[PDB]
Design a protein around this ligand. Structure first.
Ligand code: CHL
Ligand code: CHL
Ligand code: CLA
Ligand code: CLA
Ligand code: CLA
Ligand code: CLA
Ligand code: CLA
Ligand code: CLA
Ligand SMILES: CC(/C=C/C=C(C)/C=C/[C@@]12O[C@]1(C)C[C@@H](O)CC2(C)C)=C\C=C\C=C(C)\C=C\C=C(C)\C=C\[C@@]12O[C@]1(C)C[C@@H](O)CC2(C)C
Ligand SMILES: CC(/C=C/C=C(C)/C=C/[C@@]12O[C@]1(C)C[C@@H](O)CC2(C)C)=C\C=C\C=C(C)\C=C\C=C(C)\C=C\[C@@]12O[C@]1(C)C[C@@H](O)CC2(C)C
Lengths: 213, 227, 230
């Protein structure tokens, strides 16, 4: 009864519509096993939330570069930051995996053993690391405003928004990479060029996407 | 028993003649949802009433000031003497503020019918608002609504639908020929066979953009006419 | 039953008119959680009371000292106490005042006693409204006065934001900026100096220097979210 990605086709048995963003899309049956699906649900949310941060960061800095505030392009930012600020790349890389390793490992072992991180072993904190649902930590640290601790109906609506905006951001980040490879320019240079002449400046005329053209 | 848009057709089960100007016409079935029909009826009234003002404005303005091309009347240099070369940004500020108020007031009436009938400052002033889209009261000072309202609503929607088609005829005629509705009529009468759509449809007389006090505004015809 | 921010609308369930200034406005549902609302209620009063004093302070400075721009008052002010002497006093005095206010919020009634003089104590009170020595004079009904405080407070919070963005866009104080509007109202609004259309975006230039030199150091002074300006 619920809308599906391919109208007319029944949804698969293992997608029962409870999860956020459930449109019955799993043509390769990758999440058929329930234990695999829980792992994939968290994988989609981690990917989506990183993509949303990346899309917003790329967009903001691209605007700054466009209006001449001196920001580099996202594909040049890495070089400019280390050279301008005299930062050792390997040292920054090691710190990143220490901090991400700690946060990721604790997340990893909450999936393997829910609520196991709330025993007080980490500096005595108990409730903030209990977790609420698979992929939805909650609590005072991860949900300081308690928007998951108010109206239940409102909370479910936010889950639908989060995953949909997350999927859109993942597609957008794929677009940034593909557009940079095809055009060699920044995302808003591409947008500006399209707006100037939409009929003649698009992927069909970039000389790469349609090689036979 | 009412006449329908075509002979031998059957009106949709949800079009029973309750609304004015009901010919049972809905090829795309957009009005099958009862909630959508109410919203689409409001937008039809807005298009009908704004279109009638548009046709009257273009026709009256062309008679009063034949030298002014209605298509370009929006440029600040073409404004009347008191407002000539007025800051278009400041002009837009008034329109945004005032239209946002009246449109949200009208919008809240759709959301909760009968909830914004009263003056928010001077309590006691109210509009009857018998039906959604028909405020009445201060909006009907001459009291014509105190009569055959259903007949008047039929007349309003019939003239409104005709004006909607009429105005888009003005826009397309302006783009194709670069003349106002009355100027276009005169051109046809003088040379009916040498001046008609068969020859003008291939030409779009609108520039690709115009400069308005330093801001470049993109322009477009409604079809890929030959610039 | 009560006037609403949007007349004809239905307020959210978690808002019932108990709080002063409750006009049923919480579109995002930030105050649904009871514990969050207690913290947010305290925060709104503090923001409003700071903003009211700041807006009144800025206006009086301009009248009394029209030659000094309030946005520049940080660097133009010279006193014997110096920069770090003033900051040190401010830090300790504010740390004491804020921790005591904070403790009342966590555990109401626990900081009503005067630490030094044992005979002075605040009478029992609601959180955010410490009576006693803080309220020697109450002109009228508290319920009505609480509404007046929050309504003037919410207006002063917006006024300060108006001062900041006007200063960065015009480089003038609130009164000087107003007189500019009155001279040419049709050519001084934000619409009159900015516009974005498909293919072209025009924004005003930031009228604040990118940096300030102050006693041998350079203080960055960036405009607020300039890249996002209309
Ligand atoms: C999402 C992850 C991610 C992606 C897609 C990129 C992508 C990029 N980085 Mg970036 N980085 C990423 C994470 C990070 N970068 C950096 C630090 C840098 C620096 C310092 C530089 C880049 C540069 C580059 C570009 C060239 C890559 C290259 O030399 O490939 C060739 C190498 C490989 C294919 C090996 C990859 C092995 C895994 C490219 C746009 C370069 C740039 O901007 O040049 C103009 C550059 O100099 N990145 C840090 C901080 C430690 C990251 C942390 O996660
Ligand atoms: C409510 C607080 C407050 C606000 C809103 C401002 C606002 C302003 N000050 Mg002012 N100041 C404030 C407090 C103070 N200022 C100064 C001293 C100065 C100087 C010397 C200068 C300004 C300047 C400015 C302007 C631009 C600053 C900027 O962009 O910096 C960008 C941001 C930074 C440089 C750092 C930001 C720090 C961070 C936001 C907060 C840090 C909090 C502390 C760690 C907390 C601990 C300390 C204690 C005391 C609370 C702007 C109008 C400059 C000006 O006039 O430009 C034209 C200028 O030169 N201020 C003192 C010392 C008495 C303050 C004490 O509270
Ligand atoms: C890595 C990101 C990722 C992951 C792990 C998932 C995971 C999931 N998605 Mg999601 N999805 C994603 C990205 C992702 N999605 C994106 C970007 C979109 C937008 C196009 C969607 C749109 C979408 C819909 C509409 C639905 C799901 C659903 C699901 C669930 C069931 C299907 C499944 O088991 O897939 C497991 C997936 C993987 C193990 C990833 C395999 C990746 C391979 C190796 C590469 C694929 C490359 C790809 C074809 C390139 C596309 C290019 C093109 C865009 C030009 C599951 C939790 C269904 C659901 O019920 O959700 C609640 C559902 O209805 N997803
Ligand atoms: C996961 C996403 C992500 C990543 C990997 C980056 C990465 C980067 N950002 Mg971006 N950014 C992001 C999200 C992200 N951003 C988001 C969501 C926003 C808000 C919309 C921004 C807004 C932003 C700004 C305004 C700037 C950067 C800049 C930078 C660079 C330096 C970062 C730094 O010094 O941090 C260290 C900072 C902290 C630890 C403070 C917290 C670096 C290439 C800087 C840049 O372009 O430098 C050339 C820069 O000025 N970012
Ligand atoms: C919503 C419909 C609409 C719109 C957007 C316009 C727009 C315009 N008209 Mg038109 N007009 C309309 C309806 C409309 N008219 C109607 C219904 C009539 C018939 C009564 C006219 C009769 C008319 C004339 C006779 C003239 C215009 C003119 C103008 C211009 C503005 C003049 C000015 O500064 O006014 C300033 C307005 C005010 C100070 C407020 C007036 C408020 C009252 C209540 C109205 C502009 C191109 C002038 C022009 O230069 O045209 C080329 C002009 O001379 N219009
Ligand atoms: C199937 C219908 C069809 C299609 C796909 C095209 C396609 C094209 N026409 Mg042609 N054209 C047609 C029918 C059609 N035409 C007819 C019937 C006439 C006579 C009225 C013309 C007269 C005409 C001219 C004068 C020019 C073109 C040109 C063009 C180009 C588009 C730009 C333009 O100015 O269009 C303008 C044309 C139209 C908007 C015609 C729309 C016809 C619709 C789609 C079909 C239904 C029409 C209907 C029966 C009413 C006809 C009029 C009525 C009074 C009898 C393009 C190659 C231009 C070009 O590039 O020339 C080199 C150009 O200058 N066409
Ligand atoms: C948010 C509060 C605030 C802040 C941070 C400032 C900051 C400043 N003011 Mg402003 N001012 C404020 C409120 C504020 N004012 C208010 C409410 C008024 C109206 C009475 C004024 C009237 C005013 C004038 C007339 C002048 C300033 C000036 C100044 C500057 C120099 C201050 C100085 O020399 O102090 C020196 C301090 C003293 C000699 C002792 C002051 C002791 C006071 C009276 C105690 C107040 C206690 C009270 C309970 C605090 C409540 C704080 C808060 C909760 C509201 C400085 C930038 C001067 C300026 O512009 O210089 C360039 C200036 O001429 N202010
Ligand atoms: C002293 C350091 C410094 C400097 C000189 C700049 C300079 C700039 N920033 Mg950055 N920024 C910084 C630190 C700094 N930033 C930090 C620490 C943060 C995290 C709080 C940010 C977050 C940030 C954002 C979100 C944005 C900028 C933007 C900008 C540009 C316009 C000014 C603005 O909106 O600032 C706003 C910055 C602050 C209010 C923080 C000042 C902290 C001292 C400008 C190139 C804008 C831009 O165009 O980005 C593309 C923009 O939107 N900055
Ligand atoms: C597209 C994508 C995944 C798409 C997956 C698809 C379609 C899967 C489809 C299916 O599997 C299903 C569902 C079900 C199966 O039955 C069928 C198939 C068909 C197999 C992921 C993107 C995932 C994208 C992600 C995570 C992007 C992250 C980006 C980040 C962190 C960027 C960071 C920075 O950009 C900043 C901010 C500033 C710069 O200067 C520096 C850097 C570092 C570059
Ligand atoms: C509002 C409107 C016009 C408004 C014009 C105005 C204000 C003009 C103002 C000015 O000109 C002046 C006075 C003077 C100028 O100097 C300046 C401007 C500013 C230019 C027209 C709408 C015009 C609207 C039109 C033509 C709409 C037509 C819709 C149709 C035919 C729909 C049909 C169907 O939807 C049904 C009903 C049922 C479905 O099942 C099937 C289908 C077929 C989809």
């Amino acid at each position: 009864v619920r809308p599906v990605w391919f109208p007319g086709n029944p949804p698969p048995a293992h997608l029962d519509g409870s999860l956020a963003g459930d449109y019955g899309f799993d043509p390769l049956f990758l999440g058929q096993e329930p234990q695999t699906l829980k792992w994939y649900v968290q994988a989609e949310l981690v990917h989506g939330r990183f993509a949303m941060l990346g899309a917003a960061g790329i967009i903001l800095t691209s605007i700054g570069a466009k209006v001449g505030l001196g920001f580099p392009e996202w594909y040049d930012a890495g070089k400019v930051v280390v050279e301008k600020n005299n930062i050792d790349f390997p040292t920054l890389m090691v710190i990143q995996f220490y901090l991400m390793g700690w946060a990721e490992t604790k997340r990893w072992y909450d999936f393997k053993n829910p609520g196991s991180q709330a025993d007080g072993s980490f500096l005595g904190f108990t409730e903030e690391f209990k977790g609420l649902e698979n992929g939805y930590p909650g609590g005072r640290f991860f949900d300081p405003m308690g928007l998951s601790r108010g109206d239940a109906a409102k909370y479910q609506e936010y889950k639908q928004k989060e995953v949909k905006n997350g999927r859109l951001a993942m597609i957008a980040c794929l677009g940034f990479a593909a557009q940079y490879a095809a055009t060699g320019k920044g995302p808003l240079d591409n947008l500006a060029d399209h707006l100037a002449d939409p009929n003649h400046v698009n992927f069909a005329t970039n000389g790469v996407s349609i090689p036979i053209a | 028993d009412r006449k329908l848009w075509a002979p031998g057709v059957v009106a949709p089960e949800y079009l029973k003649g309750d609304l004015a100007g009901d010919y049972g016409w809905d090829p795309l079935g957009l009005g099958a949802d009862p909630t959508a029909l109410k919203w689409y009826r409001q937008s039809e009234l807005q298009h009908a009433r704004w279109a009638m003002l548009g046709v009257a404005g273009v026709l009256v303005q062309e008679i009063v000031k034949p030298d002014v091309y209605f298509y370009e009347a929006g440029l600040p240099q073409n404004l009347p003497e008191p407002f000539t070369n007025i800051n278009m940004g400041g002009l837009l500020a008034w329109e945004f503020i005032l239209m946002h108020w009246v449109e949200v007031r009208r919008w809240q009436d759709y959301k909760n019918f009968g909830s914004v009938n009263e003056d928010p400052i001077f309590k006691g002033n109210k509009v009857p608002n018998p039906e959604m889209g028909y405020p009445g009261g201060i909006f009907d000072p001459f009291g014509f609504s105190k009569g055959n309202l259903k007949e008047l609503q039929t007349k309003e929607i019939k003239n409104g639908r005709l004006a909607m088609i009429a105005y888009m005829a003005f826009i397309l005629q302006a783009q194709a020929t670069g003349k106002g509705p009355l100027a276009a009529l005169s051109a046809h009468l003088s040379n009916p066979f040498g001046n008609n759509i068969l020859k003008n449809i291939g030409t779009c007389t609108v520039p690709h953009s115009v400069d308005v006090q330093g801001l470049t505004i993109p322009l477009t015809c409604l079809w890929p006419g030959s610039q | 039953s009560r006037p609403l921010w949007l007349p004809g609308s239905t307020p959210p369930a978690h808002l019932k008119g108990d709080l002063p200034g409750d006009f049923g406005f919480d579109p995002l549902g930030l105050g649904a959680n009871a514990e969050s609302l207690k913290w947010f209620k305290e925060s709104e009063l503090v923001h409003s009371r700071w903003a009211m004093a700041a807006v009144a302070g800025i206006l009086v400075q301009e009248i009394v000292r029209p030659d000094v721009f309030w946005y520049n008052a940080g660097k133009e002010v010279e006193s014997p106490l110096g920069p770090l002497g003033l900051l040190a006093v401010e830090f300790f005095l504010m740390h004491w005042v804020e921790v005591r206010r904070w403790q009342d919020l966590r555990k109401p009634g626990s900081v009503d006693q005067d630490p030094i003089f044992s005979q002075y104590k605040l009478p029992p009170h609601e959180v955010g409204y410490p009576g006693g020595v803080f309220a020697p004079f109450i002109p009228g009904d508290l319920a009505e006065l609480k509404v007046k405080e929050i309504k003037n407070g919410r207006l002063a919070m917006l006024a300060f934001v108006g001062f900041v963005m006007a200063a960065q866009v015009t480089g003038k104080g609130p009164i000087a900026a107003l007189q500019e509007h009155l001279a040419d109202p049709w050519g001084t609004t934000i619409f009159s100096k900015a516009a974005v259309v498909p293919g072209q975006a025009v924004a005003p230039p930031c009228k604040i220097p990118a940096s300030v030199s102050y006693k041998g150091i350079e203080i960055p002074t960036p405009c607020f979210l300039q890249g996002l300006w209309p």
